[PDB]
RNA sequence: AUGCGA
């Protein structure tokens, strides 16, 4: 109905979170070539890239909780800075066209 | 296939000296050896002089205490080593020109 | 600076972070994290290293990314092969978990840096000094607790649970 | 001693003044008195090269397959 | 000079039989430099597994050792005089050391073989079947 | 756009409509044919042997194969001759002059070229070129003791990326994006209308468009920049 | 852009940040801070200041067995020869110390009491790698050479630079 | 400003 939510949320509870991304791309990797202590250098597993197969209904493995924390934070960061760069967007031309 | 040990020399005879890459010294340069009998162990210091410079070397006691150097001479035909305990001495060379200095200041006062 | 890095695993909390300006700035320690407040027995570590085959820097006379530099608290003590880098790191961890070498405090962090194409400059940087952040993990070969810091962690394979311990990979 | 394009004082180890800035042969040491170009010279040459980094290109990638 | 009162004059040196079995480039003799932890008493040895080339493991009272052998540092087929690891040879208790040579060529020589005793350690393997219980 | 009206877009682009008759292969030829080509882009290796009793710099630049850069940049070894002998050398030799200021086989026709370039350039002494392909260009440079020391490799690096085999001013690369929901076009990453004016036989010039407001204002005038603003923001 | 940063902290936990800079000219300059104002010195001066040594000992200290780095051979020749250019008169370490004492005597507040040798040496002892402590001057020499080698390895790009903001590199 | 609600 679109009361709240999207089919994305329904899949995130009932299916999977999937691949987390940052700034437009996959999980950060250490200079050693490891994306988490638990991963051997260059682990080619999708999970090692951040693809979360676990879902909120059945939980997520800890490596995936560590990645979903990345996505949730960097989202909240962008959320807190976009509004600071949008005030100047409003005022800069609002003075002009007033 | 293992090499046998023929003889060991345990008393001071041979020494080892660290220098700059290129060290050659006069055809006659002489090396003054010194000895320390610390408690029960010996620490060694070398000192020599030449016509212009003077070379002085000493042992790194904390690496000396944790590692000990041995040198041997092997003959393949006699299969035999003459073992020699040798101190490694880190040598530096100062010259007579390296012994000149200025006043303790440049003679300044307030205004300067 | 605010980006949560994977290095923080075990040291900073992935969820304890305020929301607003401080987000990412006000980190929070893990509930199992400890901070070194002293330094110890660093004086005896050179002796054991010398026993292990580290050439003393006066004698080594070599330097480069081509060789492993063993340093203790920022006191450069020697150079060895990178292979000896790994041998020292692992045998060091064995003598760390052992109890017969009192010149070797449990809380020493064994920074091994393997040789790597355009990687971090190699070396074996040990640290025992103050302010190290330290966290326990279980060392499997001696089945006993071992203290690891964030520097050495970078190159360490720590399984998150016993069933995911990968053969020849996870050491803790 | 001469190494590469460096020439060190053989007696003292000082990187003595370049045979190019000498009128005699023996580059004399500023710490020692040794002769030099009086004694020849370390036909100073170096095979210097590019780091294989200055020149990114698809063709560099064509060197990779 | 004879500084740091903590020092003594020398009184005892030993002649080096450099040429009692030398022949110019004919005797393949060697001089070695070996590093020994202070913990071992070298003089109480009897043979030396340096011939193992690489597998120079050695076991002295159940203590495990490895003798790292290097052909570089001095026997390098690459550079002229890579070593300041100077050999200083005496003659008599009343004479000062001399720079090694094999004739009077002002020639610093090199160590044919350099060895290093490193104390080995068990570092036992992980019992995977016991640890990775699900 | 709105806040700074910056005359320097970060990614200034010019869209080029290609005639219905323009084949996809012709279009790919044009995409390669317009993109800038630096001398660096063809360079494989540069060896500088500084031997000091003039100061000798034997610079041997062993390039790729003639066919390699001929198939990446559609250029010849002769064009390499002209660029090196006229541009590259002149700029490198001038940069060497700048560094000094900071301090203070072999045929007759080839011999005539080498002598002529010496006659055109004050520092150069020899010239050996791989005339069989262009695989390398070696030239000996001799300098007085008074020249002291420079990092010639670094000088070379800087000069390689400042020499162009082919450069359309301000224009870097022409790409072949997939045509979609509209005419086939090629999007270049640079803006130079005047140069496409020569390409009229492939581009209905009346249909060139760009993200660069200022360039439109200078060329196509105030109303076109106006329409570009409303389109770009849209 | 390249540079090395070591944060030397004395036993008492007081800190002193020391930076090495690679100039485009091959010159390396050392940054430090005194009376919380910053001061720059050529590194070859602090080297000749730590221990009496030969030029071959410093050269051997940096490149060593690495005799094949034409890149490093030439940059390091620029460094040492360049020092020989600037200071032909600093012939021995003591004189160098006199130069440092003379140039910092106004600010190290040691005057009417200390000689330029004392002021200079006290500066070394109070600034350069204080984590190594007093009389670590051969050891401080070795460490400073290690930083020069790491700096040139960074310059070539044979090693990555680290991230100050990684928890990995922090206390 | 430190921290914080939104
Ligand atoms: Zn000299």
UniProtKB/Swiss-Prot annotation, chain A:
Homology family: Belongs to the RNA polymerase beta' chain family.
Entry's localization field: Nucleus, Nucleolus
Name recorded for this polypeptide: DNA-directed RNA polymerase I subunit RPA190
Note: Present with 2840 molecules/cell in log phase SD medium.
Boundaries of the shown chain within the full protein: 931 to 1028 of 1664
Organism: Saccharomyces cerevisiae (strain ATCC 204508 / S288c) (Baker's yeast)
Span list, region Bridging helix: 62-74
Gene responsible for this protein: RPA190
Oligomer and partners: Component of the RNA polymerase I (Pol I) complex consisting of 14 subunits: RPA135, RPA190, RPC40, RPA14, RPB5, RPO26, RPA43, RPB8, RPA12, RPB10, RPC19, RPC10, RPA49 and RPA34. The complex is composed of a horseshoe-shaped core containing ten subunits (RPA135, RPA190, RPB5, RPO26, RPB8, RPB10, RPC10, RPA12, RPC19 and RPC40) where RPA135 and RPA190 form the DNA-binding cleft. Outside of the core, RPA14 and RPA43 form the stalk that mediates interactions with transcription initiation factors and newly synthesized RNA.
Curated annotation (Swiss-Prot), chain C:
Coiled coil regions, renumbered to chain: none
Top-rank taxon: Eukaryota
Subcellular location(s) per record: Nucleus, Nucleolus
Further comment found in the protein's record: Three distinct zinc-containing RNA polymerases are found in eukaryotic nuclei: polymerase I for the ribosomal RNA precursor, polymerase II for the mRNA precursor, and polymerase III for 5S and tRNA genes.
Role, per record: DNA-dependent RNA polymerases catalyze the transcription of DNA into RNA using the four ribonucleoside triphosphates as substrates. Component of RNA polymerase I (Pol I) which synthesizes ribosomal RNA precursors. Besides, RNA polymerase I has intrinsic RNA cleavage activity. RPA190 and RPA135 both contribute to the polymerase catalytic activity and together form the Pol I active center. In addition, subunit RPA12 contributes a catalytic zinc ribbon that is required for RNA cleavage by Pol I.
Family, similarity comment: Belongs to the RNA polymerase beta chain family.
Entry protein name: DNA-directed RNA polymerase I subunit RPA135
Gene coding for it: RPA135
Included range, full protein: 517 to 688 of 1203
Curated annotation (Swiss-Prot), chain D:
A cellular component annotation (GO) from this entry: RNA polymerase I complex
Annotated residues for binding of Zn(2+) 1: 9, 12, 29, 32
Subcellular location: Nucleus, Nucleolus
GO aspect biological process, one term: transcription initiation at RNA polymerase I promoter
GO molecular function, one term: RNA polymerase II-specific DNA-binding transcription factor binding
UniProt zinc finger (C4-type) residues: 9-32
Region annotated Interaction with RPA2, chain positions: 1-59
UniProt keyword annotations, A-Z: DNA-directed RNA polymerase, Metal-binding, Nucleus, Ribosome biogenesis, Transcription, Zinc, Zinc-finger
Further remark: Present with 8450 molecules/cell in log phase SD medium.
Protein family: Belongs to the archaeal RpoM/eukaryotic RPA12/RPB9/RPC11 RNA polymerase family.
Record's function text: DNA-dependent RNA polymerases catalyze the transcription of DNA into RNA using the four ribonucleoside triphosphates as substrates. Component of RNA polymerase I (Pol I) which synthesizes ribosomal RNA precursors. Besides, RNA polymerase I has intrinsic RNA cleavage activity. Proposed to contribute to the polymerase catalytic activity and form the polymerase active center together with the two largest subunits. Subunit RPA12 contributes a catalytic zinc ribbon that is required for RNA cleavage by Pol I. Involved in transcriptional termination.
Name this polypeptide is given: DNA-directed RNA polymerase I subunit RPA12
Species assigned in the record: Saccharomyces cerevisiae (strain ATCC 204508 / S288c)
From Swiss-Prot, chain E:
A molecular-function term among this protein's GO annotations: DNA-directed RNA polymerase activity
GO cellular component, one term: nucleolus
Residue numbers bearing the Phosphoserine modification: 38
One GO process term, biological-process aspect: transcription elongation by RNA polymerase I
Localization per record: Nucleus, Nucleolus
Top-level taxon: Eukaryota
Keywords: DNA-directed RNA polymerase, Nucleus, Phosphoprotein, Ribosome biogenesis, Transcription
Cysteine disulfide partners in this protein: none
Oligomer status and interactors: Component of the RNA polymerase I (Pol I) complex consisting of 14 subunits: RPA135, RPA190, RPC40, RPA14, RPB5, RPO26, RPA43, RPB8, RPA12, RPB10, RPC19, RPC10, RPA49 and RPA34. The complex is composed of a horseshoe-shaped core containing ten subunits (RPA135, RPA190, RPB5, RPO26, RPB8, RPB10, RPC10, RPA12, RPC19 and RPC40) where RPA135 and RPA190 form the DNA-binding cleft. Outside of the core, RPA14 and RPA43 form the stalk that mediates interactions with transcription initiation factors and newly synthesized RNA.
Function: DNA-dependent RNA polymerases catalyze the transcription of DNA into RNA using the four ribonucleoside triphosphates as substrates. Component of RNA polymerase I (Pol I) which synthesizes ribosomal RNA precursors. Besides, RNA polymerase I has intrinsic RNA cleavage activity. The heterodimer formed by RPA34 and RPA49 stimulates transcript elongation by Pol I.
Family: Belongs to the eukaryotic RPA34 RNA polymerase subunit family.
Note: Present with 3360 molecules/cell in log phase SD medium.
Recorded name of the encoding gene: RPA34
Full protein stretch here: 23 to 156 of 233
């Amino acid at each position: 109905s679109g009361a709240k939510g999207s089919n994305v949320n329904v899949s995130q509870i009932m299916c999977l979170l999937g691949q987390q991304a940052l700034e437009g791309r996959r999980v950060p990797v250490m200079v050693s070539g490891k994306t988490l202590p638990s991963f051997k250098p260059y682990e080619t597993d999708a999970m090692a890239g951040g693809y979360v197969k676990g879902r909120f209904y059945s939980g997520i493995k800890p490596q995936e909780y560590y990645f979903h924390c990345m996505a949730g934070r960097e989202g909240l960061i962008d959320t807190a800075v976009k509004t600071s760069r949008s005030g100047y967007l409003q005022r800069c031309l609002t003075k002009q066209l007033e | 296939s293992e090499i046998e040990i023929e003889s060991v020399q345990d008393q001071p005879s041979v020494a080892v000296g660290s220098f700059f890459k290129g060290f050659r010294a006069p055809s006659d340069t002489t090396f003054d050896l010194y000895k320390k009998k610390k408690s029960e162990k010996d620490e060694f210091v070398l000192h020599g002089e030449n016509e212009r410079l003077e070379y002085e070397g000493y042992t790194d006691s904390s690496s000396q205490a944790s590692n000990q150097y041995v040198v041997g001479l092997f003959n393949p035909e006699k299969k035999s080593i003459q073992l020699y305990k040798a101190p490694v001495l880190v040598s530096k060379v100062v010259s007579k020109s390296s012994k000149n200095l200025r006043g303790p200041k440049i003679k300044s006062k307030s205004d300067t | 600076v605010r980006k949560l890095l994977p290095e923080s695993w075990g040291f900073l909390c992935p969820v304890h972070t305020p929301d607003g300006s401080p987000c990412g700035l006000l980190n929070h320690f893990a509930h199992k994290c400890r901070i070194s407040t002293q330094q110890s027995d660093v004086s005896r570590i050179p002796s054991i290293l010398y026993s292990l085959g580290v050439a003393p820097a006066s004698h080594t006379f070599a330097a480069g990314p081509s060789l492993c530099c063993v340093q203790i608290d920022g006191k450069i003590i020697g150079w060895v092969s990178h292979e000896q880098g790994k041998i020292i790191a692992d045998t060091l961890r064995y003598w760390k978990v052992e109890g017969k070498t009192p010149g070797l405090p449990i809380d020493l962090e064994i920074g091994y840096v393997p040789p790597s194409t355009r990687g971090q400059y190699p070396g074996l940087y040990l640290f025992g000094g103050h302010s190290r952040m330290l966290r326990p993990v279980r060392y499997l070969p001696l089945d006993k607790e071992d203290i690891v810091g964030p520097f050495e962690q970078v190159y360490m394979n720590i399984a998150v649970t016993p069933q995911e311990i990968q053969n020849n990979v996870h050491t803790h | 001693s001469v190494v590469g394009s460096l020439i060190f004082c053989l007696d003292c180890g000082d990187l003595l003044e370049n045979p190019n800035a000498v009128l005699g042969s023996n580059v004399e040491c500023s710490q020692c008195k040794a002769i030099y170009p009086k004694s020849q010279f370390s036909n100073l040459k170096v095979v210097t090269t590019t780091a294989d980094d200055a020149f990114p290109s698809s063709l560099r990638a064509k060197k990779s397959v | 000079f004879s500084i740091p009162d903590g020092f003594k004059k020398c009184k005892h040196l030993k002649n080096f039989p450099l040429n009692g079995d030398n022949k110019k480039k004919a005797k393949q003799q060697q001089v070695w430099l070996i590093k020994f932890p202070s913990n071992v008493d070298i003089s109480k040895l009897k043979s030396l597994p340096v011939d193992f080339e690489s597998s120079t493991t050695m076991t002295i009272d159940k203590h495990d050792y490895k003798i790292m052998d290097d052909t570089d540092i001095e026997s390098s087929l690459t550079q002229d005089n890579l070593s300041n690891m100077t050999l200083l040879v005496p003659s008599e208790s009343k004479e000062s050391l001399k720079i090694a040579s094999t004739a009077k060529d002002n020639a610093p020589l090199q160590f044919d073989k350099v060895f290093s005793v490193s104390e080995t350690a068990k570092i036992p393997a992980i019992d995977y079947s016991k640890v990775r219980v699900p | 756009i709105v806040m700074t009206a910056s005359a320097a877009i970060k990614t200034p682009q010019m869209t080029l409509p290609i005639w219905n008759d323009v084949s996809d292969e012709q279009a790919d030829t044009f995409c390669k044919s317009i993109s800038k080509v630096l001398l660096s882009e063809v360079i494989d290796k540069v060896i500088v042997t500084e031997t000091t009793a003039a100061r000798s710099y034997v610079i041997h630049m062993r390039f790729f194969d003639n066919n390699e850069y001929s198939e990446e940049y559609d250029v010849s070894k002769e064009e390499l001759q002209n660029v090196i002998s006229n541009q590259f050398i002149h700029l490198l030799e001038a940069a060497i002059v700048k560094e000094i200021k900071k301090q203070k086989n072999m045929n007759k026709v080839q011999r005539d070229r080498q002598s002529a370039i010496i006659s055109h350039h004050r520092f150069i002494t020899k010239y050996n070129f791989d005339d069989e392909s262009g695989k390398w260009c070696e030239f000996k440079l001799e300098l007085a003791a008074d020249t002291e020391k420079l990092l010639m490799v670094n000088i070379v690096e800087e000069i390689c990326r400042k020499s162009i085999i082919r450069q359309i001013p301000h224009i870097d690369r022409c790409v072949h994006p997939e045509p979609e929901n509209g005419k086939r076009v090629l999007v270049t990453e640079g803006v130079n209308f005047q140069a496409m004016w020569d390409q009229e036989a492939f581009i209905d010039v009346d249909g060139i468009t760009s993200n660069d407001v200022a360039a439109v204002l200078k060329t196509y005038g105030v109303e076109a920049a106006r329409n570009t603003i409303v389109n770009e923001i849209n | 852009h390249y540079g090395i940063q070591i944060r030397s902290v004395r036993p008492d936990q007081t800190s002193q940040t020391n930076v090495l800079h690679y100039l485009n000219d091959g010159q390396v300059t050392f940054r430090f801070s005194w009376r919380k104002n910053e001061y720059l010195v050529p590194v070859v001066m602090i080297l000749k200041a730590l221990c009496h040594t030969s030029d071959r000992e410093i050269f051997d200290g940096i490149i060593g067995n690495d005799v094949k780095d034409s890149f490093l051979t030439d940059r390091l020749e620029l460094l040492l020869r360049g020092f020989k250019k600037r200071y032909p008169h600093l012939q021995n370490r003591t004189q160098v110390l006199q130069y440092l004492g003379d140039k910092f005597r106004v600010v190290f507040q040691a005057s009417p009491d200390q000689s330029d040798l004392e002021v200079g040496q006290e500066v070394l002892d109070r600034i350069v790698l204080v984590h190594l402590g007093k009389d670590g001057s051969q050891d401080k020499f070795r460490m400073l050479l290690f930083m020069i080698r790491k700096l040139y390895s960074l310059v070539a790009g044979e090693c990555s630079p680290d991230n100050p903001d990684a928890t990995q590199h922090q206390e």
